[model samples]
Target: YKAAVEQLTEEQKNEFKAAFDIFVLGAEDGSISTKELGKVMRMLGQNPTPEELQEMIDEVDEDGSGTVDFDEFLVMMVRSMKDDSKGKFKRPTLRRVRISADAMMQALLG
Candidate 1:
């Protein structure tokens, strides 16, 4: 988990964290629920189906906790960054998520 987060630049990490906190802020548990995930996608202008939302949660909810914690979320971000560098058309949802992460960071922090 540390290794994955280390792949991001300091600025990227701060932006990612800011976006993550927005989702987490909706819940009191300090983690992102599937419902919150859906809201996030919607905020990014994507309407993911219920099944797609479940799939996303399953992919990153490493502890099978039915929610995404910061570490698990970091893995997804790192993977997205890698795919971005390779210019591969894979996991487009993650790509979109990162873009929104930057946007949210600027909107909130700037």
Candidate 2:
């Protein structure tokens, strides 16, 4: 996963790191829990219900840990980039989804 991230442009790498850091605020644990995920979604201008938030986390919660670590978040961001290139915004079994790399970048860096 680190190798995949290295393939990104320097600017992209920096931006993603900055966004992740912002999202992980207040936790100081290097991971985003469901509650933090809810906050992030709201900050990004989406108001998903708690159940929806749980579903979003479940999609990429990779180790069944009920939280999203940096590595899993990176995979989601990379996947979103590829989906964007294809002109399709797809997430794993998520309906009414608003999570995406572009949204996060705009929200955090704007």
Candidate 3:
């Protein structure tokens, strides 16, 4: 657990804490869209588009109220957290395959 906690960069750790703090507020009187997702994605540093903001708004605003309730915000937050964190486990993306019997044999032997 300590190691896992240490794995997060200082920025990531700070963001995680901020997200938790926002959710605590959401527990009371429900959270607004920007207030919630902003925890995951800071807009001032990178202001969100209506389309981007709408994705979160639509989730909590299930009744089409154009606002997110606390419960809805919680659900969306959980999903968003997963989506954001999964980006951590990055493998080499889209590498061209180079076929070489000698290289393959060497790699396999090693």
Which residue pairs clash within candidate 3?
A: 43-47
What lDDT score belongs to each candidate, Candidate 1 first?
0.83, 0.76, 0.54
Q: For candidate 3, what is the TM-score? A: 0.34
Off by over 4 Å in 1: 7-10, 85-110
TM for every model, in the order presented, reads 0.64, 0.64, 0.34
- Tell me the lDDT of model 1 at 20: 89
Best by lDDT: 1
Residue range with the least summed lDDT across 10 consecutive positions in model 2:
90-99
Per-model tally of clashing residue pairs: 0, 0, 1
Residue-by-residue lDDT tens digits, candidate 3, 3-107:
234534767666655755664564444446555555546633766766787786675576676666544544554556445654444431221123245468879
Q: By summed lDDT, which 10 consecutive residues of candidate 3 come out lowest?
A: 90-99
Q: Of the pair 2 and 3, which is ahead by TM-score? A: 2
Question: Candidate 3: which stretches are off by over 4 Å?
Answer: 1-30, 34-44, 77-110
- Candidate 1 lDDT over 1-110, as tens digits, reads 55657757888878889988999978878999888999889999998999999998998888998999887888888877666765545576676689789889999999
Error of 1 at 52 (Å): 1.7
**Each model's RMSD to truth, in Å?**
12.2, 12.8, 11.6
RMSD of 1: 12.2
* lDDT at residue 29 of model 2 (Cα atoms): 69
